[PDB]
Amino acid sequence: SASEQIIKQYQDIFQIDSKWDKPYYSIGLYYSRLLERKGRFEYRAISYFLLAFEKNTAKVRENLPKVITFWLDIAAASISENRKEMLSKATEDICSHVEEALQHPTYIWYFVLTQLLSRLLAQIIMHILLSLAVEYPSHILWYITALVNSNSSKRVLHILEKYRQHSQNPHDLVSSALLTRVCLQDVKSITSRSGKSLENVAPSAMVVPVRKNLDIISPLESNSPFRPVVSIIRFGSSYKVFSSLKKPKQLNIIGSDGNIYGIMCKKEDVRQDNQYMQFATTMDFLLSKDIASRKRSLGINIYSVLSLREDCGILEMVPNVVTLRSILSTKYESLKIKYSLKSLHDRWQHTAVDGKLEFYMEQVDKFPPILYQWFLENFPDPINWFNARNTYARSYAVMAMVGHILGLGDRHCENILLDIQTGKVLHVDFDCLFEKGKFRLTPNLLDALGIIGTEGTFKKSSEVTLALMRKNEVALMNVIETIMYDRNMDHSIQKALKVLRNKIRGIDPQDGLVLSVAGQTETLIQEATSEDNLSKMYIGWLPF
């Protein structure tokens, strides 16, 4: 009921300029929530939030969607053109954008502008768009090459904008000269590296090296000087070796620059980087914030990805890791009794409905769990052994929980990660929602932890995750969900709008009420653990 005297308050004490500086968010921050609850007055939305970041330069989430809130709105107006007025303002409201970039610094885009291309992958509103992008590129010399490493891959092999992206390389040598082209040789070499990946010593067909910038996922650190966006890293020389290209289009290379690193740029889905960047945003968000998160050093781990072709793309790499049937089968196949291969699908194809589904598996269970030994007999003395088991589960739920949070893929063998000499976790591919058939725990895993199965760490860890989740509320809900706006698949789900923010507050699964935040683990852990569902899930997942 203050809706008129809401605003009138703001205008009052702005006399003090920043002072607390907190207000300059709250102008539009509320005014975003104003229309959100339900656009002439919308021209004050970004016009408010612009001057704030100039002053504060903190909380990268406020300007994360403030782009889409701003730019999106303007584009909408243009398209519509009520509509007339909208468009008129959009050419008047968004006028405060570039005019601020002069006043307002050059690094503000790198984190946000990562999704500037990554949303669509247009001409109506793109006018003022790239004028800031590549300009800052020139200004950010260190990242110019990184952005070049980012940008030059699209034109190195998407056509109409590709030339427009090549025209960005055209405007570049015009703007950047107001080196790169020498580094641009890597772009054609990239596609050639992708061509050698497509099709060591002569087959390699790549010499010289001595390139510009590969930092293996530059951080772009904030708060905590701020000039460190690219930090100190660089790279030079590389030699041969091989990937084996073990799956289909994949490519995995060593990098000989400094120490020994391996950066595997593997041809796969281009937008796979979303959760690769998304979880990379929260992992850095969760990490520092508050105490209960920070005290246990949560956040799991991530690694870079970039776009090259509609196939080639890019990915970083994780050293010293073994997974799936190599490790797992090894232990008990020492006793043999290992190999069901494609009999289990067969044998389970021989039954359906409710008849055997818990049973052939409870025979497959007769391969007893050895997993606990793998941590144990591997690196002895407990001070390692102990500290690992902690870091194991401490790094298992904090992520696997986020799985049903986004509802993404059933983890099986190949897509699950466990590092050696220590323990961690990582998660990839795109198995968004649904399922066809019938977070994956089994006979070994649960018991393979401290004889208590799931009690000590699983409970109090996963909860701290679910603490900050609902707490920051729309914050992480605002940004990374553009990943949903990118790919629409398997018919169309715009229902994912609401079930999006409701599973944050956890109301939907049992239709009655929000469940106690401790229970929201309980009901969701007691579910996905199950007994019947777990025993009768698609067999292709090596269930027990």
Tell which residue, 411, 414, 413, has the closest CA to residue 435: 411
In a 10 Å sphere around its CB, with 0-12 CB exposed, 13-18 middle and 19+ buried, how is residue 159 labelled?
Answer: exposed
Beta-bridge mates of residue 255: 261
Six token digits for residue 118: 């990554």
User: How many residues can be counted in the chain?
Assistant: 544
What is the rounded CA–CA span in Å between residue 396 and residue 338? Answer: 26
Phi, psi of 261 (to 5 degrees): -130, 160
Quick check: 418 and 321 in contact, CB under 8 A? yes
**Coil, helix or strand for 483?**
helix
What is the rounded CA–CA span in Å between residue 28 and residue 26? Answer: 6
Residue 180 has, within 13 A of its CA and on its CB side, a CA count of 23
Angle CA(150)–CA(151)–CA(156) in degrees, nearest 5? 110
**Coil, helix or strand for 419?**
strand
Quick check: 149 and 213 in contact, CB under 8 A? yes
Q: Which amino acid is at 426?
A: L
Quick check: 316 and 217 in contact, CB under 8 A? yes
**Coil, helix or strand for 286?**
helix
Q: Which amino acid is at 395?
A: S
DSSP H or E stretch at residue 30: helix 23-36
Quick check: 318 and 417 in contact, CB under 8 A? yes
What is the rounded CA–CA span in Å between residue 479 and residue 65? Answer: 6
What DSSP character marks residue 541?
A: G
Six token digits for residue 74: 């303007």
- Solved by what technique? cryo-EM
**Coil, helix or strand for 120?**
coil
What DSSP character marks residue 479?
A: S
Q: Which amino acid is at 202?
A: A
In a 10 Å sphere around its CB, with 0-12 CB exposed, 13-18 middle and 19+ buried, how is residue 178 labelled?
Answer: exposed
What DSSP character marks residue 321?
A: B
What DSSP character marks residue 107?
A: T
What is the rounded CA–CA span in Å between residue 394 and residue 415? Answer: 19
Quick check: 22 and 48 in contact, CB under 8 A? no
Quick check: 468 and 288 in contact, CB under 8 A? no
What is the rounded CA–CA span in Å between residue 144 and residue 176? Answer: 9
Six token digits for residue 513: 């009420």
Question: Which residues 6+ apart lie within 8 Å of 25 measured at CB?
Answer: 49, 52, 56, 59, 62
What is the rounded CA–CA span in Å between residue 320 and residue 327? Answer: 13
Tell which residue, 469, 479, 481, has the closest CA to residue 63: 479
Quick check: 140 and 106 in contact, CB under 8 A? yes
What DSSP character marks residue 410?
A: P
Quick check: 87 and 70 in contact, CB under 8 A? no
In a 10 Å sphere around its CB, with 0-12 CB exposed, 13-18 middle and 19+ buried, how is residue 283 labelled?
Answer: middle
CA 282 and chain centroid, separation? 8
Beta-bridge mates of residue 321: 419
DSSP symbols for 322-361:
--HHHHHHHHHHTT-----TTTHHHHHHT--TTSSTTTHH
Residue matched to tokens 């992958």:
121
Quick check: 454 and 525 in contact, CB under 8 A? yes
Beta-bridge mates of residue 419: 321
Phi, psi of 403 (to 5 degrees): -60, -60
Tell which residue, 121, 129, 22, 21, has the closest CA to residue 67: 129
Question: Which residues 6+ apart lie within 8 Å of 460 measured at CB?
Answer: none
What is the rounded CA–CA span in Å between residue 196 and residue 101? Answer: 42
CA 456 and chain centroid, separation? 28
DSSP H or E stretch at residue 467: helix 456-472
Tell which residue, 39, 18, 148, has the closest CA to residue 87: 39
Six token digits for residue 34: 């104003």
Other CB atoms within a 10 A radius of the CB of residue 168 amount to 21
The span from the first CA to the last CA of the chain, in angstroms, equals 58
**Coil, helix or strand for 126?**
helix
Residue matched to tokens 């070049």:
148
Quick check: 204 and 256 in contact, CB under 8 A? no
Six token digits for residue 303: 């690694």
Q: Mutual orientation of helices 382-394 and 397-406 as an angle, nearest 10°?
A: 10
Q: What is the CA radius of gyration of the chain?
A: 26
Residue matched to tokens 């701290």:
464
What separation in angstroms does the CA of 255 have from each of 240, 245, 265, 301, 359? 9, 16, 11, 21, 49
Other CB atoms within a 10 A radius of the CB of residue 529 amount to 14
What is the rounded CA–CA span in Å between residue 476 and residue 478? Answer: 5
Residue 390 has, within 13 A of its CA and on its CB side, a CA count of 9
DSSP symbols for 219-275:
--------GGGGTT--------------SSS-----B-SSS-B--------STTHHH
